[PDB]
Structure 1
Amino acid sequence: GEWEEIDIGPFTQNLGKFAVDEANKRGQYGRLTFNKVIRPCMKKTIYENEGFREIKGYEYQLYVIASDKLFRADISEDYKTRERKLLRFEGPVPPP
């Protein structure tokens, strides 16, 4: 399986902040205030399909508490540029 649990240290918390910033732009929940990312944070690596199967990027699934509510965010991150995209941000979700 290509998903693996990663740490919820500062880089992951900053991913959650990105997710909340992007969720605020989408506005589905109105303005939210990032609180923290909780376990589990899952990452999967996306590879090119052919050639050297270079890593194309990553996808993360995060559980982020924002405005005291728990959301699940899916975030892509390009390997070469570090460009992140919020793919999904939903909740309030059950605690994982």
Structure 2
Amino acid sequence: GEWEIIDIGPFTQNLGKFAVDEENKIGQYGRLTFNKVIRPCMKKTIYEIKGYEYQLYVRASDKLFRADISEDYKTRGRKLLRFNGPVPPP
């Protein structure tokens, strides 16, 4: 596992939207409206690379949540691993 901080550009905002979409299907937090992914955004590269994990602070419905997203290198499948909160801002 190697870690880096990545920026919060539209590619990163997409992962936030994915987190919210997936959590909305699960329904534990009710109906969330995605607002924004905030800093800091972290990315772990899992090793030859197997895939990645992104740790995000996602603001949905004016609340902040922690979402972890896994991404497989070969298949490019993504999965929401964790989604909890509300948490205070970092």
Q: Give the TM-score of the pair, scaled to structure 1.
A: 0.90
Determine the C-alpha separation between the residues in 2 that align with 1:7 and 1:66: 19
Q: CA deviation at 1:2?
A: 2.0
Determine the C-alpha separation between the residues in 2 that align with 1:68 and 1:57: 31
User: C-alpha offsets along residues 13-66 of structure 1, whole Å, 9 cap, x if unaligned?
Assistant: 00000000011111110110100000011000111xxxxxx2110000000000
Sequence identity percentage: 93
Q: CA deviation at 1:79?
A: 0.6
Name the residue aligned to 2:43.
43
Name the residue aligned to 2:84.
90
Q: CA deviation at 1:82?
A: 1.5
Name the residue aligned to 2:53.
59
- 5+ residue gaps, structure 2, are none
Superposed CA RMSD in Å reads 1.0
Structure 1 consecutive aligned stretches of length 4 or more whose deviation exceeds 4 Å: none
Matches within 5 A, 1:65-76: 65-76=59-70
Q: How many residues align?
A: 90
Determine the C-alpha separation between the residues in 2 that align with 1:91 and 1:2: 26
Task: Return the index of the structure with the highest Cα Rg.
Answer: 1
Name the residue aligned to 2:8.
8
Q: CA deviation at 1:12?
A: 0.2
